[PDB]
Symmetry: D2
Subunit: 354 residues, 4 copies
């Protein structure tokens, strides 16, 4: 019937989305709220509920418990949105104790035996678990979801690359504060200011996009991914949720904006075909107004709110270049929501027992 | 020997920069402050001094006077930052009454006998005045300055186009509130939001960049400007001053980021050679840190604060593509400061008598 | 099963009528009216500056003219119209026989028009009968007070009912939505605080006084004429939520702990009658010294946005306490208060099925 | 001759104001710039210049030096804006080495032998230095300046208390981000939010106000300060500088707002009588418009920008109650500026030699 989940980092900006979404989930229960600094306290009392609505009634009085595999014989699934550096070793201890771990943290994203999973783009990479368990000599496993900023690009770019001779994408991002966590970005960095994130962050963004694109099954074979040029210039400003990206996308041969638009509108993959509960009907929603999408108004779009990437502004720049913009909800699709969708995919494929 | 200026729209976001800058100018005097709504009242009491420092002491008691040429016998120069639509015909009346008019308004920016002037890029186009006067059959003249957002791009792009085989620039802008004037942008459009300006504004921005580039004297001759692809995706957020732009610039042939960076660092033009009072020593300042320029910290940079375009983040994307960002103070270089510098060039060239 | 028209349906108040009536057990949002936007699909023109998404069965409705003759089938008019335009329009609707629940200022001081906070002065709906006879109309007008006045008068009314309150000195830090759209320019509030000025301060206390003058008290000291009120009002860059700091003085020694229990226990006719939009706790009291906060508490309560959230109850001296209050300015402060008033009027037989 | 100052915490939000103001001071030079983390590096490269203008050119290349009494033989004055906890003992080490220490830190604010100094209000309390040197057995001394929030209230309240039977003041504050320092207040605490500071901060505020008021020499003797009731409810929002306060002020007997207004307009103290360089002409500036003062427009008011408290909105509430508002620049008057003014007074009264 129902799987009992633990949410690690349950009070954090990603944790609250697991709590919110799992409270309404048909078969995965938020059964165990883990923390460190606030172990012992009622969740409703200490959480910064920086998201829609209010802490779920049935969750407010639940006690925050230790992050300890041995206290968790009763848990079936581990969701892990832990800070970088701390996540890595914890997620291994859970896998070594036999748990399926779905991680939103960066630590394991480039391990060659760990899926870097966007369920609509590279669902077959869950097969990596087999080799992982064998070589790591553990009975559980780790899957990761990618950097939210990498997903806001990789989703529409992956859709495009599957059917077109895309040879470059040159990206500018304007990301929200919640992507940095709490305390995260100091207020003085973003009041009357735009904070560039710097070369390191630009680089890791395209690095993750390349891995995700390398794992997409294409309908055309040109150009080779090695010959695709990607670049990002990334920034944070004083928005709460929603990462906005402007993409100039180039092609090896003449490509019509209107054909690419239809490809984006019609985009679907295995989560849709399988009818997974958290799969949006329209993982890419395309808007036609020239002032949409906007962060405030469109970050909760779609039949599963916050699970759809919202694209718009599709326009021919020249015969071999188009402009589009994309908006992703950074803690729903970009983190917890993609993590729950991944869990549903793993359950359906037989990797996690119901 | 000195000149008396009138400042039309003196209380507006551009007008206050003319007031602030001219209060210290060695020879152009802010003598007549014009307006519509508050005519009769002291300047200091009606103005929203949304800029550095305080209303100048010898200005605050000056009365706001009508915009009427028949009241203006004693004035030598008109500065005109009037709204789109209202500006065109008023600017014509002033020219017909014999006044030199330096306008920051869009209305005359594409008249082929009217200069669209960035003093460092196309100073020779002041020559259009001779034909203008003949054909319009007036004794005065109109000179315009370009859209601030177009200058933020055209200054660095013009310096590059001069010396390199630039064949494309793909731009994303993150502009400040003050560019829209007052009441300008509603607060609800920009709190926890990014506001795209739309296809019209994107189109007019590149149209102005094309006209400016078409008038830059190049040291190379490939490609022809007709084969350069330009595109912009423009937005406003809740910054007060400073327009921030991300430029991906492509070349016809292999081109080194470090060479382009030196061309930018070394950029100077006729305003520097002439030592005009408002000419920055470094019309383009290059920063090397991967988190600079930042809007709050770098919008008043330079020996003439706010007159320099600040570029940074220079980086190779691939052999034929570089990334850079630029920051322009939208009401100093982008409007009043550019206008004062234009006037200084016209005075020095004998178009305005001293 | 009653049909409502929502006037000003695309406005910051109108979107709350649409959001809340979409799921109401018995009042259906049947007609969306406008001015500039008439003839367009509601979903295409609306700035949905509120939680969630435009309700699907409302997004496809066509915005219709604000015209009393075109509304044969409607039982209730909700009227969040601009000051000046509101007055005459609301009169035409009452004249045509419609119950008119108004959030606009125009009629708020007419002595035959309720200025209604359902938990504080529900008996003033009685004014309607004399209203209908003297104005000679079959419909009627009821108004809801200024959101800022409600943020103060709800907790001040609960206190005034049971304690010898003789003063309240108020500072407000109000949200941008209170001014509507285009409303407040962005340059007035970025890196700034915008005082609203003497007129707004004066109208806030004038409304509070009329409300307090209509509260049924359990004590009789001091007389209201001897109560001193003052407000200093401001807006900042918050989206919804009006936040108020109140220093409240009393004629005699009064315990903050007792006043805190009175606020926690406060209930009125809406709660007694179990009206669908009546919150269980019209006043919610928080204990943390950093709460309420605008972002986190403005949607509090079993009916989200309908409760006034109070906190920071503290003894200043024997005859003075400090508290703060937070009201959702378009839910409790406008449309949600309006809907609760409608349910009260239905229950009391003033609006017929 | 000039006095050579050391500025501790030179790169902080208070440090930058010492740097800016001392750069133009007639006789106190910013000679030694101290730090901890950034020791060794050029000041210009590491500072966040979150203030007006730019880092002074003669300062930019100065190296940040260790906070160590032994390196400072050449130093005549120490300005100390160090974090609470760390300041106490350090400021003691400097005084023990014979240095005059002007502190903005809270640590010694309530030592009964250490002045808690607002130069216009309690200038005679510098006398405390004599007992201080004797009892502590040190050649130097410590003087503190008060919490900026407390100064915003105590300046107007002290001018009133001097001449009226004031018996209560009930204060609400709306404070800026820079008052918390950097990284200071998290962005997520203030975007679309108001952050209450809590009971502790409300109490320390009135505790400091009482000490200040108790040291004001009055012209009336009722009521006794022990019988005055003070309360504050404090908050921060997303403003950069400037603390705004609403005060309801009660009196034991009938008192006219217009009379109190004139008292405020006319306020002056020893700093003005002595013509100290950093003493504003009008330490309280009174505005008449019912929408002034406003944080952005009035935080730099006055002939010494940022050194005047700006009051407005004077209004009769009842015969014994008035309402006013005050705005203080929190790092100028509220910190460095008041600190420099204290220094000038201490030099003028002969506590600091030359
Ligand atoms: N936010 C996004 O948009 C986003 C998107 C995708 C992925 N992610 C990733 O998800 C992770 C968390 O992000 P966030 O934004 O939610 O961070 P955050 O708001 O700073 O949350 C930190 C949370 O983790 C807990 N925690 C910290 N250290 C721990 C430890 N050593 N052991 C157990 N629990 C610990 C804390 O609990 P206590 O307070 O009880 O100690 C807190 O609940 C990061 O790796 C981030 O990169 C972020
Ligand atoms: N802001 C920028 O970044 C920027 C940069 C480049 C150029 N510009 C251009 O400069 C112009 C002004 O922009 P702004 O940002 O300064 O606008 P703003 O703040 O809205 O001010 C407009 C001013 O013009 C006056 N005015 C309006 N209509 C007039 C009329 N018919 N006759 C005479 N005076 C009139 C008003 O004076 P009263 O209120 O006393 O009537 C007001 O002071 C626009 O065309 C704009 O596109 C703006
Ligand atoms: N906002 C609050 O917090 C709040 C709270 C309490 C009460 N109120 C009151 O409620 C009223 C509405 O406020 P708001 O904040 O919703 O304003 P808003 O967002 O500016 O909305 C104005 C609305 O009224 C319509 N409208 C304008 N003029 C009209 C006319 N002559 N005839 C018919 N419809 C007209 C507009 O429709 P078109 O766009 O189709 O022209 C629009 O839907 C005001 O009286 C306000 O004082 C506001
Ligand atoms: N901001 C205001 O409005 C305001 C007003 C009045 C009073 N104050 C007081 O002034 C003090 C500083 O506040 P701020 O707002 O300027 O803080 P801030 O911006 O965080 O600055 C802290 C500064 O102190 C230095 N520092 C930190 N620990 C140190 C140590 N152990 N030894 C030596 N230096 C150390 C740091 O330099 P490195 O990083 O190079 O080590 C940094 O330059 C506080 O006590 C505050 O209460 C502030």
């Amino acid at each position: 019937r129902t799987l009992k989940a633990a949410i690690l980092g349950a009070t954090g900006l990603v944790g609250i989305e697991y709590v919110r979404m799992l409270s309404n989930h048909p078969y995965i229960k938020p059964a165990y709220l883990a923390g460190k600094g606030s172990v012992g306290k009622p969740y409703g009392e200490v959480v910064r509920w920086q998201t829609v609505g209010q802490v779920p009634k049935e969750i407010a009085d639940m006690e925050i418990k230790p992050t300890d595999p041995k206290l968790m014989d009763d848990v079936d699934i581990i969701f892990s949105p832990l800070p970088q550096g701390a996540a890595g070793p914890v997620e291994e201890q859970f896998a070594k104790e036999g748990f399926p771990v779905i991680s939103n943290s960066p630590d394991h994203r480039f391990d060659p035996d760990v899926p870097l999973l966007v369920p609509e783009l590279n669902p077959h990479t869950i097969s990596l678990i087999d080799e992982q368990r064998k070589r790591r000599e553990w009975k559980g496993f780790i899957v990761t979801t990618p950097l939210c900023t990498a997903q806001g690009a990789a989703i529409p770019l992956g859709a495009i690359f599957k059917d077109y001779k895309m040879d470059g994408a040159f990206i500018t991002t304007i990301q929200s504060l919640s992507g940095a966590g709490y305390p995260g970005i100091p207020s003085l960095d973003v009041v009357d200011n735009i904070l560039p994130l710097g070369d390191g962050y630009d680089a890791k963004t395209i690095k993750e996009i390349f891995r995700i694109l390398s794992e997409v099954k294409r309908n055309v074979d040109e150009p080779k991914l090695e010959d695709v040029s990607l670049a990002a210039t990334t920034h944070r400003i004083a928005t709460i949720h929603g990462h906005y990206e402007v993409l100039y996308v180039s092609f090896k041969e003449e490509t019509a904006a209107e054909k690419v638009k239809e490809t984006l509108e019609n985009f679907r993959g295995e989560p849709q075909d399988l009818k997974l509960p958290t799969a949006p009907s329209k993982p890419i929603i395309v808007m036609n107004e020239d002032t949409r999408p906007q962060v405030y108004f469109d970050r909760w779009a779609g039949d599963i709110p916050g699970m759809s990437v919202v694209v718009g502004r599709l326009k021919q720049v020249n015969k071999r270049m188009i402009r589009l913009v994309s908006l992703i909800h950074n803690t729903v699709r970009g983190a917890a929501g993609g993590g729950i969708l991944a869990a549903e995919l793993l359950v359906e494929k037989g990797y996690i027992e119901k």
